[PDB]
Amino acid sequence: AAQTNAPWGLARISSTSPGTSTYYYDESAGQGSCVYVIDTGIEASHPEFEGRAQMVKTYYYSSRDGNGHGTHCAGTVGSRTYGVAKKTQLFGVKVLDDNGSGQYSTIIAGMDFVASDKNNRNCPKGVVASLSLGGGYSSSVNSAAARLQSSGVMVAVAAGNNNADARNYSPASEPSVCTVGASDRYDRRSSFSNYGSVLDIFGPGTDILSTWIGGSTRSISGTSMATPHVAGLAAYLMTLGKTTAASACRYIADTANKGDLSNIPFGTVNLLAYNNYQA
């Protein structure tokens, strides 16, 4: 399958080189995988989800995404037009309020929820969790992300938007999950992207077009936007049987575009998520 005039990020993850416009992907497109988007929620009604998205848990008064962040992330994972894994099943877990903020306890609860809830779902190709969120280092938040990973969920988490070492941010600093830095369309590290040794992989993070609340779309920047590319790429590659939840992060790093990024500090991986698709 080839999506012409795709969002630059989708084109980037299916190309060895920047500046392409077509997203090339196996037509399986993450069919049979599940991705939990642990965020502000998902406007499941958005036509771009094609009925493949549903809210499964909220920790606030409504399951409704009143922010747009979660819908944007979910769109990058598996919307028809803006998603890496265009046939994956999306599950919204609303751990962030409609201002996009969430208590650590709530975020931990959402990770514990996914670890259990996946046992109730039909995800024959495996389960991914996209955590486009974070704050200061928390051993309990890292431990929660480690548990979700250990339960057999491919956990992708944002490195963070601090232009600092991800070691001081959670769950970014949890070694066992897939910590995702952001790149721009010119193969630069995104100016805001966290770095450091704990980063596993970069994904497109700057000026990422995706779904938004009210059935709309918008372009926003963040390691929050890079994370769902990797989460979507994990769902995609697990559907193809190329990797498992336990090994997807390592597989994505092993199969990444190596050395394509600029402004990569010494000790940070120079690896950009890449689907290695050959028609």
Binding site for Ca ion (CB under 5 A): 16, 175, 200, 260
Supply the minimum distance, in Å, between the C-beta of residue 159 and Ca ion.
Answer: 10
Six token digits for residue 146:
């480690």
18 is in an annotated binding site: no
Supply the minimum distance, in Å, between the C-beta of residue 17 and Ca ion.
Answer: 5
- Helix axis angle, 104-117 to 139-150, nearest 10°: 10
Which residue among the candidates 130, 173, 224, 229 is catalytic per the annotation? 224
- How far is 97 from 70, CA to CA, in rounded Å? 10
Supply the minimum distance, in Å, between the C-beta of residue 64 and Ca ion.
Answer: 33
The phi-psi region of residue 30 (left if phi > 0; otherwise alpha if psi is between -120 and 50; otherwise beta) is left
- How far is 139 from 145, CA to CA, in rounded Å? 10
DSSP string, 119-140: GGS--TTEEEEEE---EE--HH
Could you tell me if 230 and 178 are in contact, meaning their C-beta atoms sit under 8 angstroms apart?
yes
175 is in an annotated binding site: yes
Q: Count Cβ atoms below 10 Å from residue 131 Cβ, excluding itself.
A: 36
200 is in an annotated binding site: yes
39 flagged as catalytic: yes
Supply the minimum distance, in Å, between the C-beta of residue 73 and Ca ion.
Answer: 19
Could you tell me if 210 and 64 are in contact, meaning their C-beta atoms sit under 8 angstroms apart?
no
Which residue among the candidates 15, 26, 33, 69 is catalytic per the annotation? 69
Which residue, 197 or 216, is less far from Ca ion as judged by CB?
Answer: 197
224 flagged as catalytic: yes
Which residue, 19 or 265, is less far from Ca ion as judged by CB?
Answer: 19
Could you tell me if 74 and 53 are in contact, meaning their C-beta atoms sit under 8 angstroms apart?
yes
260 is in an annotated binding site: yes
- How far is 113 from 109, CA to CA, in rounded Å? 6
- DSSP code, position 197: T
Which residue, 218 or 258, is less far from Ca ion as judged by CB?
Answer: 258
- DSSP code, position 219: E
Strands 33-39 vs 89-94: parallel, antiparallel or unpaired: parallel
- DSSP code, position 88: P
Which residue, 165 or 200, is less far from Ca ion as judged by CB?
Answer: 200
Supply the minimum distance, in Å, between the C-beta of residue 263 and Ca ion.
Answer: 16
Supply the minimum distance, in Å, between the C-beta of residue 211 and Ca ion.
Answer: 28
Which residue, 75 or 171, is less far from Ca ion as judged by CB?
Answer: 171
Which residue among the candidates 26, 39, 165, 184 is catalytic per the annotation? 39
Which residue, 16 or 105, is less far from Ca ion as judged by CB?
Answer: 16
Could you tell me if 207 and 184 are in contact, meaning their C-beta atoms sit under 8 angstroms apart?
yes
Q: Which residues are annotated as a binding site for Ca(2+)?
A: 16, 175, 177, 200, 260
Per the annotation, binding residues are 16, 175, 177, 200, 260
Residues designated as active site: 39, 69, 224
